[PDB]
């Protein structure tokens, strides 16, 4: 009769909360999805061992089209968990899953966990200054999507930071790197020429948030576009004008060039 939405956190199997782990261990059935994001610092095997339950992995279609026939039936007379990377209900379409639960006469509860939305705070950029967020998608065939470029434009114009998620094809396990994201953005700039993303734009790269040894780098596109940020996933941020305190953190912690202390403040 109960469905638990449980977040797995940012990087490895230890990123789940004590509450989430204990509730998971008490569930009769455990489902999970790894198409929205992938726990880069662990494996399905390590997660299964930690929880001590077999985990029924679900594809995007399994969730979006058949959540009510794969998960809810069992949740009708059993305690069931639905695990997701990060914090539950962050993925755009997940909140609607609680409506499906209600319609099926199933109670649902949310067990939160760390999300990149809040973890980006490790970049030293003030959370209140982030504006609209967006995802950088790979162009394909005749389709060249660029809305993420306009998001950056509108935020920066108002002195706000722009959090950019990078493309991911979970099944094929192919991640977009910050480097690719930058090259793509320079290409969009050459097209729209809005003076939004250029070689002189200051950017911040966060790789493997959640691990004890994450890669936090800041600098100008001209110097970071070919830098090695390590293994994915990578998150790209285009900060708005900086607070001197944000700039000092980027210089002292993220190795940003002292130049930002005068140019981007």
Ligand X SMILES: Nc1ncnc2c1ncn2[C@@H]1O[C@H](CSCC[C@H](N)C(=O)O)[C@@H](O)[C@H]1O
Report helix, strand or coil for 106.
coil
| Bridge partner list, 33 | 58
Residue 115 counted as an annotated binding residue? yes
Q: How far, CA to CA in Å, does 206 sit from each of 96, 146, 198?
A: 30, 22, 19
The one among 54, 61, 92, 142 contacting ligand X by CB under 6 A: 92
Regarding beta strands 56-58 and 2-7, do their DSSP bridges make them parallel or antiparallel, or are they unpaired? unpaired
Nearer to ligand X, 69 or 147 (CB): 147
90 counts as binding ligand X under rule CB under 6 A: yes
Binding stretches for a second copy (CB under 8 A): 7, 9-10, 12-19, 21-22, 50, 86-96, 98-99, 102, 109-115, 117-119, 121-122, 124, 126-135, 154, 158, 160, 165, 209-210, 212-213, 245-246, 248-249, 252-253
Q: What minimum distance in Å lies between the beta carbon of 42 and ligand X?
A: 11
Contact 235, 165 (CB under 8 A): yes
Partner from ligand X, a second copy, none binding residue 26, C-beta < 5-8 Å depending on class: none
Cα(63)–Cα(258) distance, integer angstroms: 47
116 counts as binding ligand X under rule CB under 6 A: yes
Structure tokens at 179: 């480097």
The one among 2, 208, 224, 260 contacting ligand X by CB under 6 A: 208
Q: Please name which of 162, 205, 160 lies closest in space to residue 182, comparing C-alpha atoms.
A: 205
Nearer to ligand X, 53 or 234 (CB): 234
Cα(150)–Cα(35) distance, integer angstroms: 26
Going by the annotation, the residues of the binding site for S-adenosyl-L-methionine are: 10, 87, 90, 115-116, 166, 209, 234
Going by the annotation, the residues of the binding site are: 10, 87, 90, 115-116, 166, 209, 234
């Amino acid at each position: 009769m109960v469905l638990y939405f449980i977040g797995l956190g940012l990087y490895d199997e230890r990123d789940i909360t004590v509450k989430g782990l204990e509730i998971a261990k008490k569930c009769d059935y455990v489902f999970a999805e790894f198409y929205t994001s992938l726990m880069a610092g662990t494996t399905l095997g390590r997660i299964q061992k930690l929880i001590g339950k077999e985990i029924r992995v679900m594809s995007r279609e399994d969730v979006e089209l058949n959540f009510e026939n794969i998960v809810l039936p069992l949740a009708k007379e059993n305690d069931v968990a639905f695990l997701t990377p990060g914090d539950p209900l962050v993925a755009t379409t997940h909140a609607e899953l609680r409506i499906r639960a209600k319609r099926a006469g199933v109670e649902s509860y949310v067990i939160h966990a760390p999300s990149i939305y809040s973890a980006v705070g490790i970049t030293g950029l003030h959370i209140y200054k982030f504006g609209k967020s967006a995802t950088v998608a790979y162009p394909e065939g005749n389709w060249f999507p660029t809305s993420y470029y306009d998001v950056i434009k509108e935020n920066a114009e108002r002195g706000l930071h722009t959090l950019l998620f990078l493309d991911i094809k979970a099944e094929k396990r192919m991640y977009m790197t910050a480097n690719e994201a930058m090259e793509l953005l320079l290409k969009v700039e050459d097209m729209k020429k809005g003076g939004v993303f250029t070689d002189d734009t200051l950017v911040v790269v966060l790789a493997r948030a959640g691990s004890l040894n994450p890669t936090i780098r800041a600098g100008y596109v001209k110097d970071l576009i070919r830098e090695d940020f390590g293994d994915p996933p990578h998150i790209l941020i285009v900060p708005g004008k900086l607070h001197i305190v944000e700039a000092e953190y980027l210089v002292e912690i993220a190795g940003a060039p002292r130049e930002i202390l005068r140019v981007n403040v």
